[PDB]
Design a protein around this ligand. Structure first.
Ligand SMILES: Fc1ccc(CNCc2ccccc2)cc1
Ligand SMILES: [Cl-]
Ligand SMILES: [Cl-]
Ligand SMILES: [Cl-]
Ligand SMILES: [Cl-]
Ligand SMILES: [Mn+2]
Length: 340
């Protein structure tokens, strides 16, 4: 039967079911005040599905010049047409190949560039912004979004939203690689999965995706969304409380030293955005430092709420289109203050 919400991560993660409900804030606000992430399902059912297809982005914008990243080795592929990314999103035999002859796993960098989403894509901007959950927090003019109301003593977010486009990771070796490495933001954010592409060519790739979710520490209810309801899983997240950020820096300074990096004792491995916590490192963080995170599978139409200051990483299971908006809630404004 239909319900307002459920508890994931064995009780530690709120999942809201009705993205537009006017009373969602009554359930959300205490979890948010405690510094927890929140998941909201069902946003895809509110959107115009024809605006969020890979083939439309290629047809409309394909002659723009862009840079890509090879997710396996961090190599930059400079100054290529954006159709060269989009046309291989779901069709493996169209993908750019590495020198070994394999199809690459690619991430589209900074596209649309800087703050240009609204100017380049006005109909997509309207469709996203009118359907964001918790609109008093997330809309540019929301009553609980302080972004437009703070003086220069606070770091203010850029004008959004921002699009995040990347292929899925495929192989056993790929399990230890990030799509987006461990980092933190000084603003809050909402990240919406607007499209999931499950390919054809090397099409029959189900088994390595189940092993990735299981070794990723996903809970038993999360496993039921696949097996029972056949929803499309897009990306595996790990998120850590803002209060645990320095203990994570201590672990990564120790591992950098073990691997023969030569780093000053104060250097910031989270700001460097150079690490992905694999199963080995996640277990060492728990056992050696006492730190537990949230392992979250973001399915089509899921919105992930990321608290300001919370370290987080993303690993795509299939090809993903995500759209994110930054905001400044009163609950977490301390994280963007420029003093003490
Ligand atoms: F405060 C609230 C009271 C009720 C709700 C649930 N509304 C019905 C519904 C359930 C699931 C998906 C879509 C619609 C949500 C919040
Ligand atoms: Cl906080
Ligand atoms: Cl548009
Ligand atoms: Cl709200
Ligand atoms: Cl990254
Ligand atoms: Mn982020």
């Amino acid at each position: 039967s239909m319900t307002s919400h459920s508890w994931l991560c064995d009780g530690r993660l709120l999942c809201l079911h009705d993205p537009s409900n006017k009373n969602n804030w009554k359930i959300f606000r205490e979890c948010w005040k405690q510094g927890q992430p929140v998941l909201v399902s069902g946003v895809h059912k509110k959107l115009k599905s024809e605006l969020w297809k890979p083939e439309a982005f290629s047809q409309e914008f394909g002659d723009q010049d862009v840079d890509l990243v090879n997710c396996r080795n961090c190599a930059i592929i400079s100054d290529v047409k954006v159709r060269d990314f989009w046309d291989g999103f779901e069709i493996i035999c169209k993908r750019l190949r590495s020198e070994d002859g394999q199809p690459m796993v690619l991430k589209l960098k900074d596209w649309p560039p800087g703050e240009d989403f609204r100017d380049m894509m006005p109909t997509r901007f309207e469709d996203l912004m009118e359907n964001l959950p918790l609109p008093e927090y997330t809309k540019r003019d929301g009553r609980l979004n302080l972004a437009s109301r703070l003086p220069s003593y606070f770091v203010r977010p850029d004008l959004g939203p921002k699009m995040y486009n990347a292929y899925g990771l495929i192989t056993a070796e790929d399990r230890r690689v990030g799509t987006t490495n461990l980092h933190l933001d000084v603003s809050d954010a909402v990240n919406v999965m607007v499209y999931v592409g499950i390919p054809i060519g090397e099409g029959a790739h189900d088994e390595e995706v189940l092993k990735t979710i299981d070794e990723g520490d996903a809970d038993e209810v999360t496993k039921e969304r696949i097996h029972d309801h056949k929803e499309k899983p897009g990306a595996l997240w790990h998120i850590y409380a803002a209060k645990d950020a320095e203990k994570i820096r201590e672990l990564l300074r120790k591992v950098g030293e073990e691997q023969g990096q030569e780093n000053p004792p104060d250097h910031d491995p989270i700001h460097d955005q150079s690490w992905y916590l694999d199963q080995t490192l996640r277990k060492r963080l728990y056992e050696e430092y006492g730190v537990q995170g949230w392992a979250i599978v973001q399915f089509l139409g899921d919105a992930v709420f990321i608290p300001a200051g919370a370290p987080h990483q993303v690993h795509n299971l299939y090809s993903c289109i995500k759209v994110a908006e930054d905001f400044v809630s009163p609950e977490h404004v301390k994280h963007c203050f420029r003093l003490t």
